[PDB]
PDB file of C-alpha atoms in Angstrom:
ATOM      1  CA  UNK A 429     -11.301  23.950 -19.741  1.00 46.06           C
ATOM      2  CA  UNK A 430     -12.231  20.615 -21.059  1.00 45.26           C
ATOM      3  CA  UNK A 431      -8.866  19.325 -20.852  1.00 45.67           C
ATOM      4  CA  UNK A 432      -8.974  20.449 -17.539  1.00 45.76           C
ATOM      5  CA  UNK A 433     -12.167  18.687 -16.604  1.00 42.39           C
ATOM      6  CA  UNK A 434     -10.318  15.628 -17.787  1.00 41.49           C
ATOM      7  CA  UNK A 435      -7.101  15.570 -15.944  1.00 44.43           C
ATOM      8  CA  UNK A 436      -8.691  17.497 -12.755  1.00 45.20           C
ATOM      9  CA  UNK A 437      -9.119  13.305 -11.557  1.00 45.36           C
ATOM     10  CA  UNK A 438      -5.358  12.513 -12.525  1.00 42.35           C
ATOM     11  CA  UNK A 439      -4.251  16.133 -10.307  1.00 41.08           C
ATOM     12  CA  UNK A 440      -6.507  15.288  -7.263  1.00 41.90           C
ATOM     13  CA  UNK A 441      -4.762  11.878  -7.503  1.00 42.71           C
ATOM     14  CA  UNK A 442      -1.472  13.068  -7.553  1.00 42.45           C
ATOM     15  CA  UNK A 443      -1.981  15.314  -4.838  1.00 47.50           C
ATOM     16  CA  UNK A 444      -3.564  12.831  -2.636  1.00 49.45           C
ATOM     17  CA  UNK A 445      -0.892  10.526  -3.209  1.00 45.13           C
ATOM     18  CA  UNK A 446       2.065  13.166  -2.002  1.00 44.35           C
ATOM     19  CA  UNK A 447       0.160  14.365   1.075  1.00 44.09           C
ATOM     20  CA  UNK A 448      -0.234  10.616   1.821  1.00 40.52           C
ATOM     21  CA  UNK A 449       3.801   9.909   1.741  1.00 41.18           C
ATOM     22  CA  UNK A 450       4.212  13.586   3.057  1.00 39.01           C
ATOM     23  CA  UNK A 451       1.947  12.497   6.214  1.00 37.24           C
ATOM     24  CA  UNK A 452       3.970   8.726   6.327  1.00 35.70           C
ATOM     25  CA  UNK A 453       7.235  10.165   6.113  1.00 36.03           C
ATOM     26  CA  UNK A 454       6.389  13.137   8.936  1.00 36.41           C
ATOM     27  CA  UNK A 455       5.050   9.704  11.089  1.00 32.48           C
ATOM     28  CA  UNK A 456       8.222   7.626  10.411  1.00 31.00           C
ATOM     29  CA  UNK A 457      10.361  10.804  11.680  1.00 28.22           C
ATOM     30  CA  UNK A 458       8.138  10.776  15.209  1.00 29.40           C
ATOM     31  CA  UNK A 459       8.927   7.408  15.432  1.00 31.07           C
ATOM     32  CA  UNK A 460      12.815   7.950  14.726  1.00 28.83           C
ATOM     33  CA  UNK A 461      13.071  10.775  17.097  1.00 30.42           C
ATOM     34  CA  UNK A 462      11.358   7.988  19.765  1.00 30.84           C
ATOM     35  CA  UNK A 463      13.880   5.334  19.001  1.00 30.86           C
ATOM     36  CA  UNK A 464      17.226   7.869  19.515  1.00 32.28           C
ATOM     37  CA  UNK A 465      14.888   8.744  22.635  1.00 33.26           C
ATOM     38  CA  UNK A 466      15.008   5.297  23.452  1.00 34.41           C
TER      39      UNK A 466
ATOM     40  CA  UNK B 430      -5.389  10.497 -26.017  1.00 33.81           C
ATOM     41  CA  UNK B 431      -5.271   7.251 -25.274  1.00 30.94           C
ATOM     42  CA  UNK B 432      -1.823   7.927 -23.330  1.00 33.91           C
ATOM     43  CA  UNK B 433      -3.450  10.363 -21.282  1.00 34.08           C
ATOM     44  CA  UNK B 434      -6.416   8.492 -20.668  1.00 39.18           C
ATOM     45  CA  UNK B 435      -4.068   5.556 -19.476  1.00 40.56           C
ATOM     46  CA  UNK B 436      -2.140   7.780 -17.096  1.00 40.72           C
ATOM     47  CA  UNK B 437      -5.350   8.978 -15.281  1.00 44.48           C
ATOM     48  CA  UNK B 438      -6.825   5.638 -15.061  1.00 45.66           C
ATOM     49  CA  UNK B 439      -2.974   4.702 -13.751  1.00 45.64           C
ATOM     50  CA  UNK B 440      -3.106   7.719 -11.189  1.00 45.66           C
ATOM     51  CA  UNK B 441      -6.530   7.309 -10.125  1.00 47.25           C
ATOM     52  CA  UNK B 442      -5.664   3.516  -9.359  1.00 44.74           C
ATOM     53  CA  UNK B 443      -2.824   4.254  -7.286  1.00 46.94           C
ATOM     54  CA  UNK B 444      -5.084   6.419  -5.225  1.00 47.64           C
ATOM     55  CA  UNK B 445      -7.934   4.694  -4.885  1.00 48.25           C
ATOM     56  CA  UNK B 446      -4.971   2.309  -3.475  1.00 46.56           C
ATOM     57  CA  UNK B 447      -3.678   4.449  -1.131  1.00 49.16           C
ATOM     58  CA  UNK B 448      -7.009   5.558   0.425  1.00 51.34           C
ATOM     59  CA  UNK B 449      -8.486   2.024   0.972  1.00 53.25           C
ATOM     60  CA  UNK B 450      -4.550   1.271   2.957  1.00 54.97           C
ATOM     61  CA  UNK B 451      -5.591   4.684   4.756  1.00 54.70           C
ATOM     62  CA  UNK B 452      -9.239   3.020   6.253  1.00 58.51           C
ATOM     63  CA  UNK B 453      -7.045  -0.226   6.977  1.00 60.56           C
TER      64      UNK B 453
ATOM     65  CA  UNK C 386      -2.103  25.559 -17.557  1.00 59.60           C
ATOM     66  CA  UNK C 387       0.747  25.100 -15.120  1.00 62.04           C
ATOM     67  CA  UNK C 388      -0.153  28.611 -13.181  1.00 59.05           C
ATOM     68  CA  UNK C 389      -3.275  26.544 -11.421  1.00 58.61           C
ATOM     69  CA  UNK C 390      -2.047  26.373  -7.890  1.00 58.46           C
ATOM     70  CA  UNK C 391      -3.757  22.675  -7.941  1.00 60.74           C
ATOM     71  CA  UNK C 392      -0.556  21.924 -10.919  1.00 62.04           C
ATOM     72  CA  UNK C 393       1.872  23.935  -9.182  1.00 60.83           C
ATOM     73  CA  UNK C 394       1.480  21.434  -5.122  1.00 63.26           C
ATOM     74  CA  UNK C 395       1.198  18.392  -7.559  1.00 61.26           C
ATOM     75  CA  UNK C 396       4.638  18.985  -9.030  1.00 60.91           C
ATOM     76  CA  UNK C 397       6.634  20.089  -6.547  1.00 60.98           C
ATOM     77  CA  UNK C 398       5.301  16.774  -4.793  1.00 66.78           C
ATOM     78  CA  UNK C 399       6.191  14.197  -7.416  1.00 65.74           C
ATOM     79  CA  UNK C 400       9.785  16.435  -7.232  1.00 67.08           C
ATOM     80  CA  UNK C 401       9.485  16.037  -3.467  1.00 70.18           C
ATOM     81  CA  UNK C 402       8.601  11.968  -3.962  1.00 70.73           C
ATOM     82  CA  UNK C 403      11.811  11.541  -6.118  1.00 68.28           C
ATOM     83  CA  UNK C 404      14.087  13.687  -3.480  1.00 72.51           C
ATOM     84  CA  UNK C 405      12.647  11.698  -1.057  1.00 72.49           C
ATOM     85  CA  UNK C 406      12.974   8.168  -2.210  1.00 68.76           C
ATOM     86  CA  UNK C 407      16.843   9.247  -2.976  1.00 72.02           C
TER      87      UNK C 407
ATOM     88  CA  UNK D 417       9.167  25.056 -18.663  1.00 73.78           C
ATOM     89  CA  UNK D 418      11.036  22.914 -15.683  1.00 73.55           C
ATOM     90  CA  UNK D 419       7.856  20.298 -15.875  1.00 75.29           C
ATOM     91  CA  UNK D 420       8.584  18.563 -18.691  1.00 73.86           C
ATOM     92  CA  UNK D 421      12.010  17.969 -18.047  1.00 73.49           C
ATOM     93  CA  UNK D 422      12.576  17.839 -14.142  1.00 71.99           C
ATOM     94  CA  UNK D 423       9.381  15.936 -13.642  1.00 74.25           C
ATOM     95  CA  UNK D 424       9.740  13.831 -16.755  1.00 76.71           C
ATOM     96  CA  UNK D 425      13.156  12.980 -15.127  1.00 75.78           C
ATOM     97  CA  UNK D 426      11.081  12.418 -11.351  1.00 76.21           C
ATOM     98  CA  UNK D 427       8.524   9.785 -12.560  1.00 77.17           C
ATOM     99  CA  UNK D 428      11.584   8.315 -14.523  1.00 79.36           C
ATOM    100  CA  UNK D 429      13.557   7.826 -11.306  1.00 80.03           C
ATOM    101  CA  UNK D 430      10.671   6.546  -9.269  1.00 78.49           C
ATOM    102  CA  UNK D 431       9.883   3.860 -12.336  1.00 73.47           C
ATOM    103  CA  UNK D 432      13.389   2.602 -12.086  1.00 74.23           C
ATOM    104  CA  UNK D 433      13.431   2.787  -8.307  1.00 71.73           C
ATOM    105  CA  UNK D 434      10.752   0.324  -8.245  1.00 67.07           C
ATOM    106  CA  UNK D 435      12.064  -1.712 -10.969  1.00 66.01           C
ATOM    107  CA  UNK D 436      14.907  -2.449  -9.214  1.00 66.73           C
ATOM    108  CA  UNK D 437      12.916  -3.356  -5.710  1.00 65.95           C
ATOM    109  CA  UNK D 438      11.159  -5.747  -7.961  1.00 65.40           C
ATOM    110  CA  UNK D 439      14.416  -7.285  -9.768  1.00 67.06           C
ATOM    111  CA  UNK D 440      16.000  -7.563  -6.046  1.00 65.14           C
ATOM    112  CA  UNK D 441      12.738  -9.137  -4.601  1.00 66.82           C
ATOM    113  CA  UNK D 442      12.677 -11.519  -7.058  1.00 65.85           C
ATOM    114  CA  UNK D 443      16.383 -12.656  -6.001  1.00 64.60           C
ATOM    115  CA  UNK D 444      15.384 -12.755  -2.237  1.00 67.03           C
TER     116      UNK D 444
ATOM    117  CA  UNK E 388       5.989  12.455 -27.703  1.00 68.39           C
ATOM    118  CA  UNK E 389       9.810  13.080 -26.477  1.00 66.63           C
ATOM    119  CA  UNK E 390      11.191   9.215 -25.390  1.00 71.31           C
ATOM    120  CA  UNK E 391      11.514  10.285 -21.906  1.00 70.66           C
ATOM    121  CA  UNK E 392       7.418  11.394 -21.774  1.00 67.89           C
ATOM    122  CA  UNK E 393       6.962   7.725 -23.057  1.00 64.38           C
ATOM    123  CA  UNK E 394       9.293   6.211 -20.721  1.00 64.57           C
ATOM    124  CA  UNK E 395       7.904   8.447 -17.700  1.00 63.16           C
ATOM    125  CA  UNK E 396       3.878   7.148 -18.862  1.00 62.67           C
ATOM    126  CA  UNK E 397       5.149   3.455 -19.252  1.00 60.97           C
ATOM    127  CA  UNK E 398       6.778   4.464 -15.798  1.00 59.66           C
ATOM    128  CA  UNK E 399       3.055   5.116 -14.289  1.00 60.85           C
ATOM    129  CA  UNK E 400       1.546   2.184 -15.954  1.00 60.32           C
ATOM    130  CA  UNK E 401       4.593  -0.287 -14.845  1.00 57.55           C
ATOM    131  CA  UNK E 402       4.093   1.401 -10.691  1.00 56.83           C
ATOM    132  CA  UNK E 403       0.061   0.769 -11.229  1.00 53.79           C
ATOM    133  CA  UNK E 404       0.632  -2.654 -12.552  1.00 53.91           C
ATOM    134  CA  UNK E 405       3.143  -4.061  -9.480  1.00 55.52           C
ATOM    135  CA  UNK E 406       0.618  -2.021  -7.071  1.00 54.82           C
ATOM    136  CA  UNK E 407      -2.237  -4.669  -8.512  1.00 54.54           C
ATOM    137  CA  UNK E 408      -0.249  -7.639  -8.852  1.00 60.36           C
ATOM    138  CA  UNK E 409       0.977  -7.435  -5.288  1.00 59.71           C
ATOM    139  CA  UNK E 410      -2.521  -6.588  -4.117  1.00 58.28           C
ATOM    140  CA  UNK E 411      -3.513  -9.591  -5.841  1.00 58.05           C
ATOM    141  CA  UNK E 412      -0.743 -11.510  -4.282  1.00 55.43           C
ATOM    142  CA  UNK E 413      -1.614  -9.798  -0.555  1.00 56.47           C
ATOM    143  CA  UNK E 414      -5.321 -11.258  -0.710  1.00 57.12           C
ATOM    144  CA  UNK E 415      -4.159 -14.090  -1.721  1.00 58.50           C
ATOM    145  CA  UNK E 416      -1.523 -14.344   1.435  1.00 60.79           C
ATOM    146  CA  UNK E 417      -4.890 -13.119   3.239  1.00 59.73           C
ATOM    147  CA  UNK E 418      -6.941 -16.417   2.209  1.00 58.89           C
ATOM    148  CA  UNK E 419      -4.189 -18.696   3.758  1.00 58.38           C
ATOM    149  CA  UNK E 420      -4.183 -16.476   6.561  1.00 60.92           C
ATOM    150  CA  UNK E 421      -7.593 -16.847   7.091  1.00 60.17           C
ATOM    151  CA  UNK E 422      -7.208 -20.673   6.711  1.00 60.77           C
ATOM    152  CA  UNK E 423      -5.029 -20.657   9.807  1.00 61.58           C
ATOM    153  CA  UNK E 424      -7.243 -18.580  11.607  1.00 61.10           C
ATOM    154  CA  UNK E 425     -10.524 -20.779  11.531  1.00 62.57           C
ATOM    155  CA  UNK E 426      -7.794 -23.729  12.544  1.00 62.98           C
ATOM    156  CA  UNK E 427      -6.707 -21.903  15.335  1.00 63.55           C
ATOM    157  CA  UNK E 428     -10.422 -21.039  16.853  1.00 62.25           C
ATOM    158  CA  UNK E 429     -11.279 -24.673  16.253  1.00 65.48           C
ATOM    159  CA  UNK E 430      -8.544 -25.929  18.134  1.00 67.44           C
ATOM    160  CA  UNK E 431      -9.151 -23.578  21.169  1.00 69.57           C
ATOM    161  CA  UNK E 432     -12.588 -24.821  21.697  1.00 71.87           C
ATOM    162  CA  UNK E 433     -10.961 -28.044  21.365  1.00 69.94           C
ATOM    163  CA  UNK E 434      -7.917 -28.277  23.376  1.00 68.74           C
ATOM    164  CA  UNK E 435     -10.130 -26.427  26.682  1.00 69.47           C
ATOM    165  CA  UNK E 436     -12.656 -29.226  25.863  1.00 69.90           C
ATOM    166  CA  UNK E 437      -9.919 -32.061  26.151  1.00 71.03           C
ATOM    167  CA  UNK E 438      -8.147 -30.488  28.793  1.00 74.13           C
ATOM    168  CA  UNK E 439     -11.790 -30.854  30.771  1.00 76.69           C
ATOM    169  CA  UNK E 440     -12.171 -34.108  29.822  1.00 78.35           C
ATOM    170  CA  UNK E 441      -9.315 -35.625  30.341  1.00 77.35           C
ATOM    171  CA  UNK E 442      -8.711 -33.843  33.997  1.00 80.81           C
ATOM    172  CA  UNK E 443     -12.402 -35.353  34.880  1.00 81.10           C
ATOM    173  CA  UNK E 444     -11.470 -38.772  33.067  1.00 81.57           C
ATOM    174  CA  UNK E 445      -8.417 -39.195  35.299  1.00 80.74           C
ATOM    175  CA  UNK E 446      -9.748 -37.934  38.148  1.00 82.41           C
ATOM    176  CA  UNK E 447     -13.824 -38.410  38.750  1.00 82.12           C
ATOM    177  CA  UNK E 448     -13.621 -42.252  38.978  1.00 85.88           C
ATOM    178  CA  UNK E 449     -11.709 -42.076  42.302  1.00 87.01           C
ATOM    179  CA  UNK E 450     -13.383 -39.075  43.300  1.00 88.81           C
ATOM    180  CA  UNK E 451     -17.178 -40.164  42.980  1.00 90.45           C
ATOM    181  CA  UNK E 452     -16.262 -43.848  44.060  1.00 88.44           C
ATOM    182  CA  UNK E 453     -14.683 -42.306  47.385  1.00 87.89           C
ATOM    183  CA  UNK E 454     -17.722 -39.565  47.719  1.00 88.98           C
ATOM    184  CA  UNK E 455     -20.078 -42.712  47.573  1.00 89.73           C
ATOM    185  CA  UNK E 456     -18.204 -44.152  50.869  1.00 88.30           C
ATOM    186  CA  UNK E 457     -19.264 -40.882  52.392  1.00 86.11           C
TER     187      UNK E 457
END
């Protein structure tokens, strides 16, 4: 519980750093998929 | 646990990083 | 401890950061 | 138990990943 | 405390560290960047100024003296 209440920061962090290179890499393959457009 | 506290104050860094390059 | 679906996303991302960056 | 190992082994691998973006940066 | 849980927490530490040192190094980029900036608004103002001044110096002496003969 307590242990918990002390890395529940550290797994919020985590998290929020994968969805943010989840959500860059999705954006970078858009952009791809424009250039072979191109 | 020093380690442990380390790694969360490591994690919550690169976070707090990532968030303020999300506003930008 | 690992069951929490919270720990469960969190690892399969840092797998899916590694897979990625390779 | 494939935590410990597998994502002992992931942080690992993104520690020397960066470690060698920082040895090659500090050629260029 | 396997070595690889070690080496995967000094891993963390070492990715938190180069994120700070190049955010210190980025502001400090910034600050020259900024530099260059106030420069370049400075010499707007003053280049448009000159550009006035010197089209009117070459010019307005002619111009009134011939407007005065009018």
């Amino acid at each position: 519980q307590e242990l918990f209440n002390e890395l529940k920061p550290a797994v919020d962090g985590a998290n929020f750093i994968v969805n943010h290179m989840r959500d860059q890499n999705n954006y970078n393959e858009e952009k791809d998929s424009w250039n072979r457009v191109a | 646990l020093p380690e442990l506290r380390e790694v969360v104050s490591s994690i919550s860094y690169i976070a707090r990083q990532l968030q303020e390059q999300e506003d930008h | 401890l690992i069951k929490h679906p919270e720990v469960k996303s969190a690892i399969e991302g840092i797998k899916y950061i590694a897979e990625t960056m390779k | 138990a494939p935590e410990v190992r597998c994502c002992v082994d992931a942080v690992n691998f993104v520690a020397e990943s960066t470690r060698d973006q920082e040895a090659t940066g500090e050629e260029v | 405390k396997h070595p690889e849980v070690k080496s995967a927490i000094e891993g963390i530490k070492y990715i938190a560290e180069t994120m700070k040192s190049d955010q210190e190094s980025n502001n400090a980029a910034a600050e020259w960047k900024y530099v260059a900036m106030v420069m370049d608004h400075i010499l707007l103002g003053v280049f448009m100024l000159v550009c006035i001044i010197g089209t009117l110096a070459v010019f307005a002496g002619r111009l009134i003296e011939l407007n005065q003969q009018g």
